[PDB]
Amino acid sequence: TPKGSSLGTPVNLAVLKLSEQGVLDKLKNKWWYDKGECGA
Amino acid sequence: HPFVIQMRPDLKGALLSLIEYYQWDKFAYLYDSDRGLSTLQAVLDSAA
């Protein structure tokens, strides 16, 4: 965020909120190892 | 208002510009009623 943004702190809080809710991990798996064409 | 010459300038814009310079997002406003609520109106509207 541009420093001094009105969006900075809620966006940050949202990021760690998503991290704790397992959202970020789920998304990582969704785009990395779910759409993965070579799994083993 | 006509026939009134206010020697004193308008401070509202300077206060708002200053709040924007310090880049505050939240603050406390202690206003004197006997002075008029005009600046209060300015900072409230610029708050919204």
Swiss-Prot record, chain B:
Compartment list: Cell membrane; Postsynaptic cell membrane; Postsynaptic density membrane
Post-translational modification: Palmitoylated. Depalmitoylated upon L-glutamate stimulation. Ubiquitinated by RNF167, leading to its degradation.
Tissue and organ distribution: Detected in forebrain. Detected in dendrites of neuronal cells. Expressed in the pyramidal cell layers of CA1 and CA3 and in the granule cell layer of the dentate gyrus.
The family this protein is said to belong to: Belongs to the glutamate-gated ion channel (TC 1.A.10.1) family. GRIA2 subfamily.
Domain writeup: The M4 transmembrane segment mediates tetramerization and is required for cell surface expression.
Further information: The postsynaptic actions of L-glutamate are mediated by a variety of receptors that are named according to their selective agonists. This receptor binds AMPA (quisqualate) > L-glutamate > kainate.
Subunit (UniProt): Homotetramer or heterotetramer of pore-forming glutamate receptor subunits. Tetramers may be formed by the dimerization of dimers. May interact with MPP4. Forms a ternary complex with GRIP1 and CSPG4. Interacts with ATAD1 in an ATP-dependent manner. ATAD1-catalyzed ATP hydrolysis disrupts binding to ATAD1 and to GRIP1 and leads to AMPAR complex disassembly. Interacts with GRIP2. Interacts with GRIP1. Interacts with NSF via its C-terminus. Interacts with CACNG2, PICK1 and GRIP2. Interacts with GRIA1 and SYNDIG1. Part of a complex containing GRIA2, NSF and NAPA and/or NAPB.
Name the record gives this protein: Glutamate receptor 2
Organism of provenance: Rattus norvegicus
Residues included from the entire protein: 122 to 169 of 883
